[PDB]
Write a protein that binds this ligand. Structure first.
Ligand code: LMT
Lengths: 1037, 50
């Protein structure tokens, strides 16, 4: 400490080093919008072509669910069984488990369930992936001159782009939206009936005439003695053209005429699946979902990708352009550039205050050197603990600017003060003064990390969010202190200009300086009156409690959030059609939306990206917005935008169309809102479970005062068509049940049969009915089976037919049949309360109706008992720290009593600005407690030291302290309030967060000082008047 | 028994294409054989956990 005061250059070297390591941790540091925040989930997705919901549930799912045992750190297992034939089992794991090890554990338990699976499933593939929902980017590809359809493009992507993007550096994963080329063979059932043939033969023939076969080798090993030719055999080669697939022979007739495939069915290169069809401004487009690599730079991955695509552009088909539907990146560009704008500015502000307050250049260059260094160094402290330049850590630094600023200031001010007071040289003034603030600065570090660290040890995804802030902030802080002990004292004693004893630069200059008297006089006024109050303090206790209570009411009556919403230049709208509607009708609506946006939002919307899929019944539309710059208004912002969209599609539409903005943390809890699981426990039936579900919907429909918008999260039972095969009639007339089945299948379901080699890439061979002969129930009739004898038999000869109900989506939670009920709490009431009333209502249900919690309300049912404890620790540790610094159990109470003085402001700040008690308002709120405590501690320190090291009296010593201490206090807070204010009143991108930090902090700061510089004195004085007896107000020694 | 240009765009290239976002991949090189063997070597940054 002192040591450096006598060594300017050694400190210069610790400084130069910190600057360089931070500079390096800057040059080689990851940037991303957020950190990994969400618990790890691994999803097993597989599909069973043609299967219905109970099919996959009873063929694939339950066999997989039962084979999923003994996998490490299981949290919860939830799966969808779809009538679209797809089944997905998401296993979410314990927070901070090794993604990669858990995911390997699952793919190796599945690789054991594999042999107990359907062969259709086993051959379409059962897959394992790690589930983020956070694609860095989604690239679209289109053709301008109407040239190709969706499926053509899908292929172009899968054979020209997906492959070179996953070669773009910075790109961690590529996923594909659409379906690759396939040999699509569409049976015409009549022309099939002619030659007395079935699908089954079509399959057979196709496998037979199309294959590779293990050929072998001429002159193989061992060859015979002397042998001289050694080379490979080329055999039956898989088919290449659609033509060659036409020229495959199905039955050679008697009359010399041959029957080809070309004849019995139509043949075309077509889509592997037509569930999902995608339209970008109406033109057909096919797409890519790119995920950011682990540790990789978001902004550079995206730029490298864009460079990859322009570099491919000299090789494209005509009018085939790349489009960029979703890019989370430029919002991150603006976020980063705006937080830097803040840091630079707030530095410039502190210079401005420091000058227009010490009117002395070389002093004013000191704190300017200081914090930059603390910055750089903290980036380097983060890089050491494995972090990245992301949202949470950067607003952690913005938030930290205050402790940083007060720390540099405290020092240079104390020096200048001691010089103006006693007339010491620069150096000797420093040591006097550094020797005065030393213990205080160390103690403040122990108390500041006494509040800032407990919050790092928060659990769950919530806890993760806190971890980012807490580490950013604490390191910035402890460093601000080591800088304040090594560098600043060194830069003070070395380059600070010496001040004439009893200078105060009063009057003196005119142009620039009338202020000094005017400040001077007033600080006198101030302290006169400080004294003035210290006569009767009682009234001031009255008002104090009043402020406390007011703070309480303000606190409770303020809205509890999780984060703020961000117009990200992009949002989405989702479309729900009447159950069983058509690909084409859903598509009508999606076009309607596409046009609405392309009409009454001509100035804001650049592009609409509609996707029909997940089952004809429902479509979704990705709405992209024009750049922020040409969207000025309060109305050209997403809130009002989605307002008018949903306003449009609510009344004047045929099916439900919500328009919404995606939250910034893309996968956690809607604050007041839960995710209920209604779990069937006993050997019950799906019918009984639904009955229980609507029953609970009713029990909550009875409580509009507690719960709000309680809704199930599934699909209802739709009418499904049942074709009962009478084994007797069919086995009688001569048709093998296999044949009736797989003909019914390969007719209406479709069938993967063979593999063919298109343009050198292996694609699939799908044979199914032509569209028209497999649409309507009566058409069942056009299909016949060749019996054992040789006769064709219609299905109505051995098939009964009826309509029934069934559900398209069979949900399972942790093994058993279950049903997901989403919900949120009433306007007034806390989420947990509504969760509790839900546990009381799901307790009101019939035998076998159990309940459980998942996702959001799980992450909250964990960390709902932790919040008070970390802060009980925080209070015991801060008090212990201050008792340490001083020498008192009771003197601390002076500085702790300050905490409210900042709160009353922040609550008042948000409320009277109409905001909400979120995280940013909280880290900010803490930050405020931090300064309250700092200033108060410096006052109390100076008070005690004057008292003990100069035997001075109480009232007089505190008075003197609060007096010499005022000028810097004001400096600090002036520097802040100005630096923060922009954050409080900015628009453009991200202004939701910015304003969230700002408002709370600012209001807090204001009440903080202009309440402390009157209450702290009274604390120290009134507190001290519950200590010992004799002596006193001594004035001796 | 299959031939090299046969195996390579069906088995080699199809596997290589999925090998992105491999942590610390330095360089990736693979052989496609008419003796039927197909082999893909992934060499990594010095000291990545094998
Ligand atoms: C950076 C600018 C700071 C300077 C501006 C602040 C100066 C004035 C702020 C004072 C706020 C508290 O208000 C102050 O309270 C005490 C009363 O308790 C008054 O003081 C007076 O009243 C009480 C009587 O009840 C007496 O004990 C005391 O003899 C007398 O000083 C002050 O006249 C008043 O100004």
């Amino acid at each position: 400490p002192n040591f450096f005061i006598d060594r300017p250059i050694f400190a210069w070297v610790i400084a130069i080093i910190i600057m360089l390591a931070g500079g390096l941790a800057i040059l080689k540091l990851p940037v991303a919008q957020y950190p990994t925040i969400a618990p790890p989930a691994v999803t097993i997705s597989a599909s069973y072509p043609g299967a219905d919901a109970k099919t996959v549930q009873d063929t694939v799912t339950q066999v997989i669910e039962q084979n999923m045992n003994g996998i490490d750190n299981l949290m919860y297992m939830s799966s969808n069984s779809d009538s679209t034939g797809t089944v997905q089992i998401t296993l979410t794991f314990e927070s901070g488990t090794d993604a990669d090890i858990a995911q390997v554990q699952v793919q190796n338990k599945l690789q054991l369930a594999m042999p107990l699976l359907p062969q259709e499933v086993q051959q379409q593939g059962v897959s394992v992936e790690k589930s983020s929902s956070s694609f860095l980017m989604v690239v679209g590809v289109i053709n301008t001159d109407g040239t190709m359809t969706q499926e053509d493009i899908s292929d172009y992507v899968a054979a020209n782009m997906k492959d070179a993007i996953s070669r773009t550096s910075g790109v961690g994963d590529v996923q594909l939206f659409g379906s690759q080329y396939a040999m699509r063979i569409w049976m015409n059932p009549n022309e099939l009936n002619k030659f007395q043939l079935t699908p089954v033969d079509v399959i057979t023939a196709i496998k037979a005439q199309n294959a590779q076969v293990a050929a072998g080798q001429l002159g193989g090993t061992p060859p015979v003695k002397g042998q001289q030719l050694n080379a490979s055999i080329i055999a039956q080669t898989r088919l290449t053209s659609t033509e060659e697939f036409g020229k495959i022979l199905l039955k050679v007739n008697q009359d010399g005429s041959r029957v080809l495939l070309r004849d019995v069915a139509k043949i075309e290169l077509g889509g592997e699946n037509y569930d999902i069809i995608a339209e970008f401004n109406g033109q057909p487009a096919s797409g890519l979902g790119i995920k950011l690599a682990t540790g990789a730079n978001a902004l550079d991955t995206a730029a490298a990708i864009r460079a990859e695509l322009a570099k491919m552009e000299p090789f494209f088909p005509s009018g085939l352009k790349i489009v960029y539907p979703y890019d989370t990146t430029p919002f991150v560009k603006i976020s980063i550039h705006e937080v830097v704008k803040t840091l630079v500015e707030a530095i410039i502000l502190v210079f401005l205050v420091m000058y227009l307050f010490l009117q002395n250049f070389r002093a004013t260059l000191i704190p300017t050197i200081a914090v930059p260094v603390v910055l750089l160094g903290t980036f380097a402290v983060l890089a050491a603990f494995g972090f990245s330049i992301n949202t949470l850590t950067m607003f952690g630094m913005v938030l930290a600017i205050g402790l940083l600023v007060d720390d540099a200031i405290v020092v240079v001010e104390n020096v200048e003060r001691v010089m103006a007071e006693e007339g010491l040289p620069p150096k000797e003034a420093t040591r006097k003064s550094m020797g005065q603030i030393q213990g205080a600065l160390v103690g403040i570090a122990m108390v500041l990390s006494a509040v800032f660290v407990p919050m790092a040890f928060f659990g769950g995804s919530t806890g993760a969010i806190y971890r980012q802030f807490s580490i950013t902030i604490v390191s910035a802080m402890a460093l601000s202190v080591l800088v304040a002990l090594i560098l600043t004292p060194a830069l003070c004693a070395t380059m600070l200009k010496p001040i004439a004893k009893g200078d105060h630069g009063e009057g003196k200059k005119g142009f620039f300086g009338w202020f000094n008297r005017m400040f001077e006089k007033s600080t006198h006024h101030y302290t006169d009156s400080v004294g003035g109050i210290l006569r009767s303090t009682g009234r001031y206790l009255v008002l104090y409690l009043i402020i406390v209570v007011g703070m309480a009411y303000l606190f409770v009556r303020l809205p509890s959030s999780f984060l703020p919403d961000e117009d990200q230049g992009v949002f989405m709208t989702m479309v729900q059609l009447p159950a069983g509607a058509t690909q084409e009708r859903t598509q009508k609506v999606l076009n309607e939306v596409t046009h609405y946006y392309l009409t009454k939002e001509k100035n804001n919307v650049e592009s609409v990206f509609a996707v029909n899929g997940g089952g004809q019944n429902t479509g979704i539309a990705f709405v992209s917005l024009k750049d922020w710059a040409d969207r000025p208004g309060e109305e050209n912002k997403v809130e009002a935008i989605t307002m008018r969209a949903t306003r449009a599609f609510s009344q004047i539409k045929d099916a439900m169309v919500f328009a919404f903005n995606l939250p910034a943390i893309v996968e956690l809890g809607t604050a007041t809102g839960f995710d209920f699981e209604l779990i069937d426990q006993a050997g019950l039936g799906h019918e009984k479970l639904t009955q229980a579900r609507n029953q609970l919907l009713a029990e909550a429909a009875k409580h509009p005062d507690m719960l709000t918008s309680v809704r199930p999260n599934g699909l209802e039972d739709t009418p499904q068509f049942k074709i009962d095969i009478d084994q007797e009639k069919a086995q009688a007339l001569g048709v093998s049940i296999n044949d009736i089945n797989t003909t019914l299948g390969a007719a209406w379901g479709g069938s993967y049969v063979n593999d063919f080699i298109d343009r050198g890439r292996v694609k699939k061979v799908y044979v199914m009915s032509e569209a028209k002969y497999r649409m309507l129930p009566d058409d069942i009739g056009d299909w016949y089976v060749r019996a054992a004898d040789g006769q064709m038999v219609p299905f109505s000869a051995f098939s009964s037919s009826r309509w029934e109900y069934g559900s398209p989506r069979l949900e399972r939670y942790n093994g058993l049949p279950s049903m997901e009920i989403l919900g949120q709490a009433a306007p007034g009431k806390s989420t947990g309360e509504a969760m509790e009333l839900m546990e009381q209502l799901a307790s009101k249900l019939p035998t076998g109706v159990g309940y459980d919690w998942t996702g959001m309300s799980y992450q909250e049912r964990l960390s709902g008992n932790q919040a008070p404890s970390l802060y009980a620790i925080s209070l015991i540790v801060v008090f212990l720290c201050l008792a340490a610094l001083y020498e008192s159990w009771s003197i601390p109470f002076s500085v702790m009593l300050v905490v409210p003085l900042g709160v009353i402001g922040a609550l008042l700040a948000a409320t009277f600005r109409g905001l909400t008690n979120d995280v940013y308002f909280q880290v900010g709120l803490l930050t405020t407690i931090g300064l309250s405590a700092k200033n108060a501690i410096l006052i109390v320190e100076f008070a005690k030291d004057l008292m003990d090291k100069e035997g001075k009296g109480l009232i007089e010593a505190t008075l003197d302290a609060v007096r010499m201490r005022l000028r810097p206090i004001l400096m600090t807070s002036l520097a802040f309030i100005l630096g923060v204010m922009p954050l409080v009143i900015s628009t453009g991108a991200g202004s939701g967060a910015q304003n969230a930090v700002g408002t709370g902090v600012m209001g807090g700061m204001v009440t903080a000082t202009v309440l402390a510089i009157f209450f702290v004195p009274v604390f120290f004085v009134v507190v001290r008047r519950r200590f010992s007896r004799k002596n006193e107000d001594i004035e001796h020694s």
